[PDB]
């Protein structure tokens with residue numbers, strides 16, 4: 001019968017910090033992690049900035065020998081996973097290793113490594129492709145490498161659902177625990193899409209902000225002057241654990257995961273429907289799964305991408321789901337500060353939602369100077385808002401019309 | 413408690429055929445789908461052959477214009493998915509569309525597209541990258557395009573667990589139905605990694621057979637002269653359906669999906685442990701999940717990739733799990749004929765497992781001329797074996813030590 005699931009550990013690399021506390025300090029201070037990209041020459045590109053992880057030292061985690069074989073998205077996902085496992089205090093033993101699994105996902109995976117090997121193939125020949133090309137690039141190898149390093153023998157998989165990946169990863173990992181397939185899961189996502197193919201491919205779709213001359217103001221969810229998403233890198237990981245398992249070992253519990261929703265839009269390969277119908281279906285599924293009155297929702301960490309169509313679809317979905325209560329809850333987009341971590345967005349934002357519960361504060365939507373037509377909810381413009389938060393919801397929406405919603409609540 | 417899950421539709425593209433019945437006729441005849449790869453200069457490569465899909469006409473499924481947007485692996489997954497839904501006879505309606513979802517995955521995804529867009533980026537710069545590069549390449553677009561085309565609003569996601577993808581996709585879709593999150597799921601996987609990067613990437617790891625002189629004899633699982641796997645393309649899709657839902661509409665039921673196992677080896681990035689400990693745990697988990705004794709198993713569709721370490725690990729796992737029943741079951745590798753479809757392997761092999769139950773016949777392991785040391789099980793060498801089959805397993809073992817097992821049972 002369905003077990004309860006709590007959060008006992010969290011880990012992060014983001015454009016605001018090399019761990020959770022440093023990132024959250026930046027979130028609550030309204031700080032932007034966005035800057036001109038330094039790691040490559042983008043003069044031929046329409047977008048030349050994004051949210052880089054600054055000063056990442058892989059030798060805090062892995063030998064230089066192993067790090068050299070692994071795409072940055074794997075290095076970032078292992079960094080966040082190791083932080084989360086250490087934060088949990090959990091000791092892996094022969095008695096429990098078969099009951100601990102991992103579900104760390106990515107939207108795009110090891111595009112930097114694939115591009116660099118493609119360069120070798122075309123400039124030199126196939127004999128110069130790395131022997132580590134496949135295991136160092138493919139998306140399931142955060143789960144694989146974490147399992148090898150920590151001895152995790154539970155369910156071992158990876159989701160790839162574009163910008164919904166981190167939220168789906170955490171929800172499905174929670175279902176694994178709820179249904180008794182595991183007692184502990186490390187779940188979340190990682191992304192490092194800031195290579196020519198990533199910036200070029202999103203640039204070709206004209207999906208990205210082109211505010212090159214003022215990168216910290218580019219990400220402006222629900223602002224009338226928004227012009228697309230800001231591409232960002234990093235990772236979030238959470239240790240999910242069955243409630244009685246956590247209680248038995250005296251774990252510190254940050255919050256309980258009470259609800260998860262999925263829905264498909266079935267509308268368009270890339271565009272969200274203007275009325276947010278799929279997002280509304282998804283939230284309603286999540287609230288019913290959590291056994292809640294929608295009026296219990298205090299805080300929503302929106303997807304809030306800073307796209308014209310995305311941001312207004314989310315307002316429409318929240319109004320449809322919450323009715324008059326839409327005007328009482330607080331909703332913010334932390335992408336205003338972090339940018340869009342794609343398959344890691346739902347993972348870092350789940351962590352921000354749990355910290356909103358721990359600290360009783362709604363993170364701001366920075367850059368919300370002139371709310372657009374109909375964007376008239378409490379969007380926590382400019383500055384963090386201390387408030388009562390018993391229930392927090394984190395939404396994600398992606399290409400393919402794929403939607404996820406997580407519902408967290410205070411645990412006493 | 414849990415609902416029962418049955419298979420009511422199947423669809424496939426393989427090196428043997430452009431549908432299930434053509435592919436299956438090849439399987440029972442012991443035919444190879446392996447040949448030198450055409451319309452591609454592989455002079456500089458150590459492997460020049462594989463399993464291609466021959467004569468695929470995407471305009472049976474999509475307009476030319478929609479097809480131009482999508483990588484071949486997405487085209488192949490949509491072909492299998494549309495076939496499976498047609499084969500099921502299911503009528504999607506406003507009354508059931510929120511109860512029908514999709515989980516079609518891929519191991520490596522859009523390599524061909526990445527390679528072609530790399531060419532443009534390196535030669536001409538980012539302004540020649542296609543606008544559809546991202547949504548036409550990412551792994552969740554089979555699920556996305558299928559949901560949009562058929563109006564499916566249920567759970568919409570995509571797994572990527574390397575060579576385990578198709579098995580995990582089917583198993584987790586079965587969990588969705590069993591636990592009441594959906595009544596119908598389209599599940600499986602697709603792959604087209606025959607590009608410079610795929611042949612070059614596996615080649616650099618010296619993982620591929622290099623038997624260029626006799627491609628049809630390259631894939632020789634458990635044979636003492638095997639020298640690595642054969643890379644193959646295609647797709648498999650199954651319609652999974654809650655039993656009472658199938659019975660109410662008069663569905664044709666092929667078989668019941670009674671068990672699903674997952675485990676992680678936690679051993680090595682690409683190699684299984686010599687004793688197949690992880691594969692043994694995974695099969696034991698799948699049998700416990702089905703409430704079956706190892707002695708009830710009649711037929712195993714092996715992962716059976718034709719790698720030195722993989723093939724011998726599976727023999728050890730089967731001996732461990734099955735004890736004095738290990739010789740009574742029949743175990744065959746259909747990869748002897750199809751080669752290794754990577755993330756689609758588990759999907760086409762679940763279909764072959766279901767058809768082994770329908771037709772009471774174990775498919776052959778072709779090329780098994782000289783069984784290796786300790787390879788003394790009933791490996792169905794050379795020729796199909798009519799036999800009693802009530803319970804059939806299908807195993808997948810992938811990079812990162814990720815394991816999956818499905819258990820199918822005759823339905824009457």
Ligand SMILES: C[C@@H](O)CCn1cccn1
Pocket residue numbers: 060061082083086
């Ligand atoms: C001082 C910190 O960077 C330690 C990171 N860490 C290594 C394993 C788990 N957390």
